[PDB]
């Protein structure tokens, strides 16, 4: 199990093996809504709620579900 960093600035990715520690995403819009995409202060939480935030903390446990840069060559 693993959970990327909180997204301070240099996304390096950290561990998160305390049992309950998914990777949440603090964003306001995401998907081209300014310049640096948008707010996405990642982090690690023990609960994976779900609803219609329209702008709040997302969730996704398992492991390394908050990478962000999943761009493949080509």
């Amino acid at each position: 199990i693993v959970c990327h960093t909180t997204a301070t600035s240099p996304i390096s990715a950290v561990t998160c093996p305390p049992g309950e520690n998914l990777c949440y995403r603090k964003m306001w819009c995401d998907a081209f809504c300014s310049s640096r995409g948008k707010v996405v202060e990642l982090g690690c939480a023990a609960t994976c709620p779900s609803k219609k935030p329209y702008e709040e903390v997302t969730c996704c446990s398992t492991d390394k579900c908050n990478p962000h840069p999943k761009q493949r060559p080509g």
Partner: peptide, 19 residues
């Protein structure tokens, strides 16, 4: 006069997100 360089993060590199 810079007086706010600690707000939040963005998609990856918006050190100063707000503006």
């Amino acid at each position: 006069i810079p007086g706010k360089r600690t707000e939040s993060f963005y998609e990856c590199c918006k050190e100063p997100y707000p503006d």
